[PDB]
């Protein structure tokens, strides 16, 4: 639900 760098929510 969230990528390695935190994108998105």
């Amino acid at each position, epitope marked *: *639900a*969230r990528g*390695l*760098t*935190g*994108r*998105p*929510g």
Partner: antibody
């Protein structure tokens, strides 16, 4: 409407601990990432990592793995940054940022100045 | 980490005239989904940083239309058609395509005299 307000200035001595906060308003807090960025005085920017506001799982970059802890108090829409065993080189302004779909550092806090001195 | 190289580090400008800033990366920023996560920020004196451009050329909410961002691959550019007093401060390009996020060194705009 979208704002992130950080805690006030801190003066600490080496070896002590500090915990700074970032209260978010204007949106559903658990919908987006909270990021932490350091700026030593008169210098550039450095990403410390982020925290997942739904699961609470933190991710730290190489230079901030050890003495740093990111946390939440989701019921109060707040994220915290705790630094243990403070050292002189920790002196800087720390910023919290919130992610959007195409950008990780979209909305910024005003920053919290931490000065470490004996 | 990806090295972001901004040229020049200090750019002398004139109010009413155009300015240009170059940002080159050590590796390609074209990501898996066909998008390029290259952003630009502005940090005015005594203030916290503030979002300008994302996805190479998309201006953010309420950013003056006179700010132009362009590029692809490893070469990018931010141009200001006509510079103003509000535009003075430190500009940073930064990337989100690769972990960990990295920033350029910053480019300070000063007034020429």
């Amino acid at each position: 409407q979208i704002q992130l307000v950080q805690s006030g200035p801190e003066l600490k001595k080496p070896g002590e601990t500090v915990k700074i906060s970032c209260k978010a308003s204007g949106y559903t807090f658990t919908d987006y990432s909270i990021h932490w960025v350091k700026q030593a005085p008169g210098k550039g920017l450095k990403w410390m990592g982020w925290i997942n506001t739904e699961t609470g799982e933190p991710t730290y970059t190489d230079d901030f793995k050890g003495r740093f802890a990111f946390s939440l108090e989701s019921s109060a829409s707040t994220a915290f940054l705790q630094i243990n065993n403070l050292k002189n080189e920790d002196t800087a302004t720390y910023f919290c940022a919130r992610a959007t779909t195409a950008t990780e550092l979209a909305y910024w806090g005003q920053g919290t100045l931490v000065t470490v001195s004996a | 980490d990806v090295v972001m190289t901004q040229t020049p580090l200090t750019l002398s400008v004139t109010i009413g005239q155009p300015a240009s800033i170059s940002c080159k990366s050590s590796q390609s920023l074209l990501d898996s989904d066909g998008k390029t996560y290259l952003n630009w920020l502005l940090q005015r004196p005594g203030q916290s940083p503030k979002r300008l451009i994302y996805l190479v050329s998309k201006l953010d909410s309420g950013v003056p239309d006179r700010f132009t961002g362009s590029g692809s691959g490893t070469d990018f550019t931010l141009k200001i058609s006509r510079v103003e007093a509000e535009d003075l401060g430190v500009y940073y390009c930064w990337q989100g395509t690769h972990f960990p996020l990295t920033f350029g060194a910053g480019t300070k705009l000063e007034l020429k005299r």
